[PDB]
Amino acid sequence: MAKAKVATFWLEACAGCHMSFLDLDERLIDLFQNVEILFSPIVDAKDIPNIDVGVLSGGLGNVEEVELAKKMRERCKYLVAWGDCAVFGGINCMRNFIPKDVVLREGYIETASTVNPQGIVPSEDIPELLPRALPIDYEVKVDVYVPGCPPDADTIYYVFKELLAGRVPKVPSEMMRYD
Amino acid sequence: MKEITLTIDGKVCKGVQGDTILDVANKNDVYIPTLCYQKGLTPIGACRMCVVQLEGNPKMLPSCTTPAQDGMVVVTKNEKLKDYRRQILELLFAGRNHFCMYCSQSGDCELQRLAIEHEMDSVRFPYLYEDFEVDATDPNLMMDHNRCVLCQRCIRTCSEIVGAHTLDLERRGWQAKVIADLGKRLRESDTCVNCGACAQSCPTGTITIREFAYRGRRSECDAVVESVCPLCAVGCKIKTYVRTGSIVRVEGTGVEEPDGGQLCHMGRWWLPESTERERVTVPLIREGASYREATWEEALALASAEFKKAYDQEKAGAILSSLCTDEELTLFSALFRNALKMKHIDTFDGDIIRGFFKGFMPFREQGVRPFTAAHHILDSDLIITMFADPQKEAPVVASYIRVACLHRNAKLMNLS
Amino acid sequence: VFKLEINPVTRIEGHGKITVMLDESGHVRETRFHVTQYRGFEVFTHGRDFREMPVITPRICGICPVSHHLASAKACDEILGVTITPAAHKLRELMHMGQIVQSHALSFFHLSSPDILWGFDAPVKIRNVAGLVDRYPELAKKGIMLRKFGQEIIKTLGGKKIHPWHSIPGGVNRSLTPQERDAIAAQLPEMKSIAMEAIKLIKDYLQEGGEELKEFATLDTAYMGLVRDGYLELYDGEVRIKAPRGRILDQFDPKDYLDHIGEHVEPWSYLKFPFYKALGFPHGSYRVGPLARLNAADAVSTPEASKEFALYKEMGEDGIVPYTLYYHYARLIEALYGLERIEQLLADPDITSSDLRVTSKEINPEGIGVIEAPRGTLIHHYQVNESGVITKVNLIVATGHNNFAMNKGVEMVAKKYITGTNVPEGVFNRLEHVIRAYDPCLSCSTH
Amino acid sequence: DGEVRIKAPRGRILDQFDPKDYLDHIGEHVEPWSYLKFPFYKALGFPHGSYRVGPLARLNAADAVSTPEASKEFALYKE
Amino acid sequence: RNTVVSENPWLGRERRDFLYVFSTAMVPEEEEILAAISATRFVVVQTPFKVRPLVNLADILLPAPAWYERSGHFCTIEGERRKLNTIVPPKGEIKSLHYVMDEFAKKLGVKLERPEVSPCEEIFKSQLRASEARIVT
Amino acid sequence: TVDVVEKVKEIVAPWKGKQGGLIPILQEVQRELGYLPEEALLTISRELKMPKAEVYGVATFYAQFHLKPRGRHVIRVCRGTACHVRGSLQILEKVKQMLGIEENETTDDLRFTLEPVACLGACGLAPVMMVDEDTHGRMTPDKIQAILDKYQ
């Protein structure tokens, strides 16, 4: 009960920024002994609870992942941006130089042995897209930016270790990379 | 007094009178963040990152362009300068589209080193996601313009160091792009000597050597060996980077020498590509259309039996390479010129060497040196290429010719 | 009239959304499984140098960044037209085996072990890696050690663990010095013990729930995999599509794949549906992943994993195991295989060699590299122009081939656990476990 | 059918190659005075890569012939 | 010039039944010299690589130190001696190049007598400046 | 195509061997040809023995040079401080949406061209919308049609 209350999620991430979180192999046992993991791709909760260190990887590319980022911000006090996708926009932003219609059209209609003859353009029930991929510091005020693809396990461990001691850390220059 | 004494960050510094603050800075030890100063190229004042403050004077002035004046107190690191440098770096990151995840130069980028040094954990300014073209038409160089800080170190190294003035700026203000001739692609350019000096000058991964991308990084090098290119006579000085038994990047030292590190295509593109060739390492034998692996005893026996049946009747020669060292050539002379006394030994360019040293020989009789150094064709007034194609013979001589006849008002006349 | 949503589907990679549209009487009219993320790795790359692709393409996923790395590397090696060197082959295979081991360790122990151990009706607070560390302190540590073994191989070879750079277009950047070779080999008797204990645990789970877990989303479909002469190869080999009852249907060279595989674009999801084109959608749809490989392979090459592969084959009516939950079992066999393949690559004097790269000019206009990622067959297909600039890319990824199997599995597990009202949580966990059986990287699926 | 074999002027097989990739070996020099181009082995250059074709070049490039009775006179040609 | 260059051109215009050609296969080779090599009837190349224009005109194809596994001095026309450094050390074992020259000296009736590197003394010296006369030819 | 090779090769004759003079050497080919084709800049670079990149940089650095064929009637609106405080931006955007062409480009068939200039001098009669011939003192939102149809 006295443990901390982190809760992660990814928005338009390739999962590497969490894969680096699970790259904390033996130290994950100690972190779990120090923090209890609420809503996250590791736990089976569906609605984010009120949390302390709300983590977010991946930029904003859809509409659903803006809503969950806004939710996470509304329900924490420190927000940690994992990765260059959440800090600088990342690799997702490479679709910002062509319109979203053209993105969905070259990757679902004219994509080198796809066989749809009706131009389906799959926006039926799924979140459509955003016209430009953006970092999460566009709809969410961020407190600890952690840059990298992915942030190394040492850096993630440092950010968690410093946020559980009760301070807002800025990632030092000797241990920060953009990869 | 030429030797002036200043105070940079408390540390006392010593410099020549005409030296800028950056010169007296880099002379002693002290570090000032720079992105557009290439040792050599005349200080261009574009990045505005080297700004330093003089005591008493509340304004800030570039250390690359402002001269050092006889005694003064320069402060390089404090809060306001760090704030302004972080803002400049963030402007560069927000204006152009910088994705380090896939950049060939993520470890060498000087915009990335500065960003990490100034703890740039953000962009602050709105990301303008405009579409700058990726010019990779050239099979050797690639110009990905959305990483271009606009430092002109590539225009200046192709205007004042190479001479084949291929790169210049296109438009004004924000639309300013680095372009080849008449706003065309680098492949379509008639005036690029494909040198790569534009890739050695670019700090920000815009211009990259394609064939050695992700391997020719200076941060991931196993060793850095200084040597001399052996391909031509100019003997450019090189700083070969070695990564697991292969040269991955050949950047030319000698930015203070008249050449300026502009190694040619054969040196920035054949030297690293030659460390990745087939490398026999076992004596072969023909067998008809396809070689077979032989032992050294077998191969040297079949190659000496054919050297005894062909030496009784004269019928024997040797074509050694003039790219070999004097040790190897002296060894070959020990066997061929002295032991078995063959008068049929040559050097794969013997016509050129013997023509040169039989045309120059009259003047050796008269007692003069009938040749000078190529760096003296930079201050000449009229250059006469007699039977020469210096682009395929010694490209630094051609670059000297171009710098002379464009930026130093010479005239060219050919007798070929 | 109304529908249930399990958004977000947890303990899988990526973004998913199971919708279960019921009728007025409260029974399942139909279920579908959407992937609700899309990035556009087939429109990013137009303009980029092909050499940039083995660094751009690992960013499609972090559970398998080396699978995309190596597929892109084989595509660019076919663009160059290089041999490639045997030492490069064996080093790439070592990195791929390390990735197989780490991805299957994460897939079993981190994502799918809670349901396998505590049952589909366990409380939500305990069903995670955290409650697994708490209650089972040794099994979570063993899975962490296996994942760490795989990622130590990947880190040794390519600098970083996630998104490594080790394979250039043309060869391999870095070999293995004997010290780290011996270091990796000194942990294999322990990692094989971990893998065999997991095999025994999952075999006791499948043997306990005898017939129910044998009809838990078990539909008869085709099995695509990669094969050597007759063996199970994970790096190279021909593509083999075994029909649902044993007959090899259209074994083909991975190069000419556009004449066999097609993609149907359904409106409700960003994931295309690849299928065997001659049979048509939805009758050419096949399976990939560990189950399909072991079903398509007639034999495996490794010694100690061959025994348990034989035990797998005498369970499935002439070699074709159709059960969805056995995707866990098969997975660990793969892991086992991977481990024992590592022991074979570390016993060869070519991983420590120094002839790793082969350079070439004359860039061809097309390059297709197909490897066998842990979740299934991965196809990179680049079309470049004369200048080496990417003109058109096509990535047919692992979870794509299994999209139809996952949709039909969610349909079958919904249509057996319906309740008119009150919509319990254990049936939701079973509806999620059908997806977690394949453990899909939805980021790869939606490049 | 068969591979293309360019025997050097004194016996050594120089660049035996598949007839498909021929543009990397054979070039044509266009001299002003004739409508006939001059193909040549590109690595040696015009006019030092120029070779011969026809019956003489075939019998010079072939190490043996397959037919029984023509083999005797082919051997008499080779000695 | 001081060690190998012959005072008379012989390549092409002389038969030369045997030809030991050493080719650090770096610079594009004059194509007239390559043809002359192709009509030799036995060519022993000691090239380091297996590049195209040398594996065609070769009967033995021995290995070599490949310009980056050897060090040297390179005395030039302008006098002063440079220095080439061993960038990356050799991988295999060609075990010498003097071994090949010795095994050629062996069973040929000749010795070797390794000499010192001949000191390059700039044959053209400037004892006159801005004071020359023309030379009749 | 041959009409653009000697006219440019003759205007460069009184500048050969004289330092400077690329700004004037172009203002003349602009006044003659209406624009600066790529052939023009190519011949300027050939004759002056100045780099093609420098010629293109100077040709695209200054506003009054047009590398594409300009229209047969320019529509210079004044975006000066006096006109803008009066509301010339409204007139500019309506001639924009009315010709349907982008901010500083020509019509699809070379009839008009919009060229936002600095003060044309009538800073009293503001805003001014010159239609390539004469000033236009008031130019309220409705008076733009009665001139754009007339000059075409």
Ligand code: SF4
């Ligand atoms: S920032 Fe990099 S590691 Fe993180 S999700 Fe994006 S691509 Fe993956």
Ligand code: SF4
């Ligand atoms: S140029 Fe430098 S700062 Fe820009 S993306 Fe590349 S590595 Fe990063």
Ligand code: SF4
């Ligand atoms: S390759 Fe050389 S000539 Fe060409 S643009 Fe670069 S520096 Fe200039």
Ligand code: SF4
């Ligand atoms: S291309 Fe590079 S060197 Fe040239 S201006 Fe841009 S950033 Fe500077």
Ligand code: SF4
């Ligand atoms: S000009 Fe080129 S080949 Fe010659 S020495 Fe310099 S870099 Fe080497």
Ligand code: FCO
């Ligand atoms: N396996 C796997 Fe990941 C997926 N889908 C890839 O490639």
Ligand code: FES
């Ligand atoms: S660094 Fe001094 S201004 Fe560019």
Ligand code: FES
């Ligand atoms: S204000 Fe527009 S004319 Fe001067």
Ligand code: 3NI
């Ligand atoms: Ni994946």
